[PDB]
Write a protein that binds this DNA or RNA. Structure first.
Ligand SMILES: [Zn+2]
Length: 347
DNA sequence: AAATTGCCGAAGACGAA
DNA sequence: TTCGTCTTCGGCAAT
């Protein structure tokens, strides 16, 4: 359904005036919070790392959701893995961060307490209001003029080599270059405070994800000229639209609550590994390329396996995170959608 | 000492052709 | 389509 998908992608185009209005409203709130945190001893070198779909140029229909990471430069860090989770770690030191130590580990909850307290106090004096202190890692979520959501995620920045659990991840050697993978792994990795049970930190590579999407092609000139337009980003947009429309259509149910845009985003990266060549993502074959993303995502649902693109042994669809009935329900609707030329693209 | 700020240009929306 | 013009974003050199 290439003709319908292009129509869907056209209605999904963000308004140029809306992003200008949205970004300015986010900028005023974000610059205010950053300026305040830089005045505290604990968050001396806090910096802005814009992540998420908007800054990956894959935002879906309106610039109403902004993912923002307040990164913190951390030196001499010792990682101890929590059980065999491969993605959750205890943070030790090999400084203003000693106030957040519980013995030898870096207490997350102590750092979120001060991070949230400073942010909640600042915006109490502001049309923005706090919320979403559940889920651990996105420390806080803001709502600007009850219109735009801003997920603020506290993060540590470690410039050391990536943890051993990422050794066989980021399999981009045949898609991007092996030099690119070497260069990307020289960039820092990020630690965000996530519950697993307490005082743990999860690995975060949203900066690598953002850099890959803005440099998606195997060819360097991909999506720079009319002869090399690909549909990678458009397939991710449609994949995000399928999940969002289904989550909205079944909002009254609880089955689709666990599935996030990161799952679709992660599954998209694996399809790019399976289809490394740009000729496998031509504009004319938008239906085939989107069906590839739909088919692979279904295999992840049916096999209960969606590897983290950077941590292979971290199953995003394991039974501990999502029950089989929720994955079976989403599998049902995706095939019904595909069998009927995706009715949710109209409602 | 270390954080700040401006500069430059690609990405992609928009209108026209 | 294709184009130009437009605005936003991100890196770092300037201190
Ligand atoms: Zn491309």
């Amino acid at each position: 359904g290439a003709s319908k998908l292009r129509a869907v992608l056209e209605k999904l185009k963000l308004s140029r005036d809306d992003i200008s209005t949205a970004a300015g409203m986010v900028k005023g709130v974000v610059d205010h919070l950053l300026l305040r945190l830089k005045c505290d001893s604990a968050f001396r070198g806090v910096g802005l790392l814009n992540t998420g779909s908007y800054y990956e140029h894959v935002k879906i229909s309106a610039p109403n959701e902004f993912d923002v990471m307040f990164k913190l430069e951390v030196p001499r860090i010792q990682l101890e893995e929590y059980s065999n989770t491969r993605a959750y770690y205890f943070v030790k030191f090999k400084n203003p961060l000693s106030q957040f130590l519980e013995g030898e580990i870096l207490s997350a909850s102590k750092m979120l307490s001060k991070f949230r307290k400073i942010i909640k106090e600042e915006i109490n004096d502001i049309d923005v209001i706090m919320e979403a202190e559940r889920g651990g890692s996105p420390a806080v979520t803001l709502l600007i003029s009850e219109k735009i959501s801003v997920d603020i995620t506290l993060a540590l920045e470690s410039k050391s080599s990536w943890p051993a659990s990422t050794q066989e991840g980021l399999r981009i050697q045949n898609w991007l270059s092996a030099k690119v993978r070497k260069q990307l792994r020289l960039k820092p990795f990020y630690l965000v405070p996530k519950h697993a049970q307490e005082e743990t930190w999860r690995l975060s590579f949203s900066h690598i994800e953002k850099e890959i999407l803005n440099n998606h092609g195997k060819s360097k000139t991909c999506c720079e000229n009319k002869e090399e337009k690909c549909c990678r980003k458009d397939c991710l947009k449609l994949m995000k639209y399928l999940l969002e429309q289904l989550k909205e259509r079944f909002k009254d149910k609880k089955h689709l609550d666990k599935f996030s845009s990161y799952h679709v985003k992660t599954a998209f990266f694996h399809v790019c590994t399976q289809n490394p060549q740009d000729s496998q993502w031509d504009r004319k074959d938008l239906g085939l390329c989107f069906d590839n993303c739909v088919t692979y995502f279904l295999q992840c649902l049916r096999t209960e396996k969606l590897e983290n693109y950077f941590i292979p042994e971290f199953n995003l669809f394991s039974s501990n995170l999502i029950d089989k009935r929720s994955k079976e329900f989403l599998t049902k609707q995706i095939e019904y959608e595909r069998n009927n030329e995706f009715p949710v693209f109209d409602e």
